[PDB]
């Protein structure tokens, strides 16, 4: 059965999913990003800092992430100096946006599918409906409402969220005051207490972060009623009951560009020094092995994308030349997503899944420096049960406690008397690479400044990595492979497709930009 699902909403943009179904299982899948705005085209010729305005408008939910990496793209292009406070503020705001994204996505975009009638037979279904039904769910409402709190912190430093551009080469535009920081701490602490610990975890962030193995997590669920009936404990039990741990595996290979710089280690942003300075470590996990991320290995294929092109392009030489979808479909193109691929030695240019799971895998790599996220939990989970909708979601949710603690510490690290901005030299020429871990994964800008104008500007967003179509080798993108193998109980409401696409927290406006 060929099934074309349109729209597959709650992926922050326009997505159609075509699947071939045999015996109630997806055997092939096509993700079709359906809406193109062309920001890379628009940015050509604009002011070198136009990206700080334009790139946040790639996405409303992860615009702050776009701002972060666009700023660092300029910071690297212009060889700027970043005062530690600016790095801290950038870290805080990037993390705060993600902390907003985590519950907002989980409740408003993902968990309402847990109420699907396919699960009516589950003993947990009534509770799932009570908790996660859209708008009226008892977990939905506070989860969604409180998700605005972390971006209040963003607004304290950036003026507003979404839609600030306050991250500029050389630092940030703002100059936090004491009451800014104390309020940011208060907002974060309240949000942590009222959503993260009370509703999501039913325990302290510290207790959750003590989970180092999958068995730890299972013990955590059963440890006491609070954790058992928390949103996290319920979600795990629900997943294990309804089978969300049994599909959505995907590529099993992961890309994290990392984000969050240790302020002392990235005071002078360079492409080369980027990895060592990261707190949230970059890392490529492929064929069960850890590799260092190197932006030079990134290519974008447009073979099945609605763009002209005959070879994968590293984004520094990237091009965004749309073809009419009517013509492109005649050439087998089916998506406005480019196909980002990553050259892994011995594997060729492979699709890599990006996102929290990729980050958690990267965080389990050996040889973490002291400032760096060193977390074996998802190495263990990956080996124990492998990837799945549940594991992917747990990776996302796992970042809530981890990022909250980082933000809380970064807020304490702010030295309010110290500089937040070093006026950079706006060089007429420059090649910049900025990358961050948006909520959804590796988010990267490759910018070429020439003659005090944007010569090239190539954004590769995490969902582009995940949802980008087949490459020249016909290798399915991560979400496409994750969709393959998914059961389809009801072709009329193929919620499992939604589960898989949304387990990546897919953002289609970011996918295409």
């Amino acid at each position: 059965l060929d099934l074309f699902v349109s729209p597959l909403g709650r992926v922050e943009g326009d997505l159609d999913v075509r699947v071939t179904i045999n015996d109630g299982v997806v055997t092939s899948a096509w993700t079709e990003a359906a809406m193109f705005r062309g920001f890379e085209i628009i940015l050509r010729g604009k002011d070198p800092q136009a990206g700080l305005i334009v790139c946040p408008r790639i996405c409303g939910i992860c615009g702050g992430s776009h701002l972060y990496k666009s700023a660092y793209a300029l910071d690297t292009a212009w060889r700027t100096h970043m005062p530690p406070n600016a790095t801290l503020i950038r870290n805080i705001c990037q993390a705060c946006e993600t902390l907003q994204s985590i519950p907002r996505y989980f409740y408003a975009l993902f968990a309402i599918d847990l109420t699907n009638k396919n699960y009516a037979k589950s003993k947990l279904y009534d509770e799932a409906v009570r908790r996660f039904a859209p708008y009226v769910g008892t977990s939905y409402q506070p989860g969604v409402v409180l998700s605005a709190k972390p971006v209040e912190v963003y607004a304290i430093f950036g003026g507003q969220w979404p839609x600030s551009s306050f991250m500029v080469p050389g630092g940030v535009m703002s100059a936090p005051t004491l009451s800014d920081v104390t309020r940011a701490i208060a907002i974060l602490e309240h949000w942590n207490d009222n959503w993260l610990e009370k509703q999501w975890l039913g325990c302290s962030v510290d207790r959750w972060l003590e989970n180092k193995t999958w068995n730890d997590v299972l013990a955590w669920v059963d440890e006491n009623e609070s954790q058992y009936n928390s949103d996290c404990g319920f979600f795990i039990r629900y997943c294990l009951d309804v089978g969300l741990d049994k599909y959505g595996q995907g590529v099993g290979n992961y890309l994290a560009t990392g984000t969050y710089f240790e302020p002392s280690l990235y005071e002078n942003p360079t492409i080369e020094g980027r990895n060592a300075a990261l707190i949230g470590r970059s890392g490529v996990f492929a064929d069960g092995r850890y590799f260092e991320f190197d932006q030079a290995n990134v290519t974008e294929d447009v073979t099945h994308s609605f763009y002209e092109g005959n070879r994968p392009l590293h984004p520094f030489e990237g091009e965004t030349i749309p073809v009419n979808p009517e013509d492109g479909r005649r050439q087998g193109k089916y998506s406005w997503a480019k196909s980002p691929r990553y050259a892994v030695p011995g594997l060729g240019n492979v699709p890599l899944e990006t996102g929290p799971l990729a980050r958690r895998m990267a965080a389990s790599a050996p040889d973490a420096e002291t400032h760096q996220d060193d977390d074996p939990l998802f190495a263990d989970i990956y080996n124990a049960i492998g990837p799945s909708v549940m594991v992917r979601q747990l990776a996302r949710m796992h970042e809530g406690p981890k990022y909250y603690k980082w933000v809380r510490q970064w807020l304490d690290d702010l030295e309010l008397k110290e500089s937040f901005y070093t006026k950079p030299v706006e060089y007429a020429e420059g090649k910049g690479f900025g990358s961050t871990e948006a909520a959804r994964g590796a988010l990267s800008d490759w910018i070429v400044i020439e003659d005090s104008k944007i010569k090239n500007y190539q954004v590769v967003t995490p969902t582009a990595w995940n949802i980008g179509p087949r490459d020249a080798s016909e290798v399915l993108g991560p979400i496409e492979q994750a969709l393959v193998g998914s059961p389809i109980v009801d072709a009329e409401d193929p919620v499992e497709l939604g589960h898989v696409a949304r387990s990546f927290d897919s953002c289609l406006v970011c996918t295409v930009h």
Binding site: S6, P7, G9, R10, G13, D14, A34, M35, F36, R37, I41, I42, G45, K46, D47, P48, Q49, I53, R57, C59, G60, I61, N85, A86, R104, A108, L109, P134, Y135, V136, V144, A148, E152, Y154, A155, I156, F157, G159, Q160, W161, X163, S164, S165, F166, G170, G171, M173, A175, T177, N324, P325, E326, W336, S452, E492, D493, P494, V495, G498, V509
Partner: protein, 322 residues
């Protein structure tokens, strides 16, 4: 009141801003104010054919559509086909045609929907336009003479993104029987939000008054106004951004970021051409090319010279201190 919220060439920033609503928050708005959100690409439960059934019922009049909210641009490329924005089996613009013609009220939320916004920046690859405007030029996709069934033009809730209150309070107004209290300016923006300027309530107006410029970002923004060195469009931008604070905390200009004038139909102003980003374009190095709304260069500069002379000492010092 049924609400159908569609996204064309959107980044979903207006939805994300909208979800930051407080008083009412979005859940209480959707649930407790009698506003039946039929579907929203970011929030609607229905997918695939169940979603399209909702859309077609609204488009064909099978079920009432009281408020059609459109976010993002009306993408007309390629070649007027709109296929750079294929939604639910149609070019989004065709949905827009049908749903705007079906709704009692059409709300464009965000510059993209209102005026074309960033995607309509040259070279405008997506052939983006606003619902009833292309930038300042009235017309846009629906034409200058479009009226919803309640007789209103597209209500333009501009911004990039719109502040949640700019739409939620309008929705509350519509839900509480105060639609007749909603007046729209010449750009169809609610005057209750868009008679003020961004500058209105900016914490730097005293510096503006005394022509004391912020000189640098970061700690440089502990003093001064952003108008002179950072291209703040605050005095030329109609918004309540410093009356109704963003995220109940701040605003661009309070934080030290120049107002980009995003509530104005020309946004991004000057199409982010080189030299115009976070910079004040000046004539002869001292005269701003653009002076505050309703002023002229001669009287503005004259008053500015006098203000510079009268400037008290505190206006020359840090005020947003640690």
């Amino acid at each position: 009141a049924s609400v159908l919220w569609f996204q064309g060439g959107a980044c979903s920033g207006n939805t994300m801003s909208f979800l930051n609503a407080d008083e009412p928050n979005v859940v209480d708005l959707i649930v407790d104010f009698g506003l039946d959100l039929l579907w929203h690409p970011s929030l609607g439960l229905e997918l695939g054919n169940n979603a399209q059934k909702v859309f077609w019922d609204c488009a064909k009049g099978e079920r009432p559509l009281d408020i059609f909210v459109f976010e993002g641009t009306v993408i007309e490329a390629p070649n007027g086909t709109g296929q750079m924005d294929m939604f639910a089996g149609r070019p989004m613009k065709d949905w827009v045609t049908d749903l705007a013609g079906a709704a009692q009220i059409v709300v464009a939320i965000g510059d993209c929907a209102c005026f074309g916004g960033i995607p309509a920046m040259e070279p405008n690859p997506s052939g983006s336009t606003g619902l009833q405007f292309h930038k300042r030029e009235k017309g846009g996709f629906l034409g200058p003479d479009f009226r919803s069934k309640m007789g209103l033009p597209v209500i333009n809730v501009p911004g990039c993104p719109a502040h949640p209150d700019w739409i939620t309070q309008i929705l509350v107004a519509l839900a509480t029987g105060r639609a007749g209290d909603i007046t729209l300016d010449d750009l169809h923006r609610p005057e209750t939000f868009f008679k003020t300027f961004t500058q209105t309530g900016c914490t730097r107006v005293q510096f503006f008054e005394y022509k004391q410029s912020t000189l640098s970002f970061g700690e440089g923004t502990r003093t001064g106004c952003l108008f002179y060195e950072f291209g703040c469009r605050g005095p030329m931008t109609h918004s309540p951004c410093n009356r109704i604070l963003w995220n109940r905390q701040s605003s661009k200009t309070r934080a030290g970021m120049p107002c980009l004038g995003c509530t104005e139909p020309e946004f991004p102003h000057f199409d982010l051409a080189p030299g115009t980003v976070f910079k004040t374009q000046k004539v002869s190095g001292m005269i701003p090319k653009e002076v505050p709304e309703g002023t002229d260069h001669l009287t503005y500069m004259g008053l500015a010279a006098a203000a510079r002379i009268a400037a008290p000492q505190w206006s020359k010092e840090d005020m947003f201190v640690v």
